[PDB]
Amino acid sequence: IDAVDASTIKRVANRFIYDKDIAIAAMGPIQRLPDYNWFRRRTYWNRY
Amino acid sequence: GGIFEALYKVLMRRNSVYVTFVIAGAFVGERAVDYGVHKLWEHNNVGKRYEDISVLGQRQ
Amino acid sequence: IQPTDVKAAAMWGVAAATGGLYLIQPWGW
C-alpha cells in the first residue's frame, strides 16, 4: 500500500480513466440528466 | 490499424501539441497542393508561356 | 507548479512558433 505514490496514481488513472468508454444507469425524474455525449466528452481536458 | 493507435498515443495526450500539429499540417499541405496544381498547369498547355515566344528579344 | 510551468512552456512555444512564422513566411521550409 505505501508503495503507491502520486506518480503511480497518475499512471493508473491515465491507464483506466482518461478517454475511455462508460456505462450509465439512471432511474426516476431523469429528464434533466445530461445525455451520453456530454459524459463521454467530459473524460478528457483540452486545457492541457 | 495499430498505426492509428500509435499516432493517437504519440500526439494526443496534450493539446498544445495538437495545435502545433494542425498548423504544421496546414502549412505543408498548402505547399503540396500548390506544387501539384502548378505542375498540372504547366503540363496541360506547353508552348504558350511567356518564355516560349521566338521573337522576345528582336526589338532592339 | 511543474506541470503548470511546462504547460505554460508548451503554450508559449506554440505562440512563439506562430509568431516566428508570421515574421518570416518561407514557402519551401
Side-chain angles (χ1 to χ4, degrees):
Chain A
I1 284 174
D2 51 278
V4 176
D5 51 355
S7 173
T8 302
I9 297 293
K10 280 177 187 170
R11 190 185 70 69
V12 188
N14 211 338
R15 172 185 161 190
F16 276 131
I17 287 179
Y18 183 93
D19 191 1
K20 317 284 194 230
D21 271 15
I22 58 170
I24 318 177
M27 172 165 213
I30 56 168
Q31 202 173 94
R32 203 171 172 172
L33 192 71
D35 62 358
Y36 185 104
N37 270 307
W38 198 92
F39 287 107
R40 183 47 179 93
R41 188 262 182 273
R42 285 311 201 284
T43 53
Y44 49 77
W45 284 349
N46 282 347
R47 50 179 64 71
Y48 268 81
Chain B
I3 293 303
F4 294 160
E5 187 186 8
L7 186 65
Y8 164 84
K9 57 183 56 185
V10 168
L11 285 165
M12 184 177 177
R13 184 178 291 173
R14 311 296 101 181
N15 205 39
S16 63
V17 184
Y18 195 68
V19 169
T20 297
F21 188 67
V22 160
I23 285 177
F27 300 169
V28 174
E30 162 89 25
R31 180 207 77 196
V33 298
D34 276 331
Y35 191 90
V37 65
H38 285 172
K39 182 63 69 177
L40 199 156
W41 179 260
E42 278 185 72
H43 169 277
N44 183 24
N45 62 6
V46 55
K48 294 188 202 165
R49 317 174 314 120
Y50 159 63
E51 293 103 0
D52 268 354
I53 51 186
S54 60
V55 298
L56 188 153
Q58 287 69 60
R59 185 173 172 152
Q60 180 157 11
Chain C
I1 315 305
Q2 285 305 123
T4 295
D5 266 19
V6 306
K7 162 207 170 185
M11 281 321 177
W12 266 128
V14 173
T18 310
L21 275 192
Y22 289 165
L23 185 61
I24 286 177
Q25 298 191 355
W27 71 296
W29 181 61

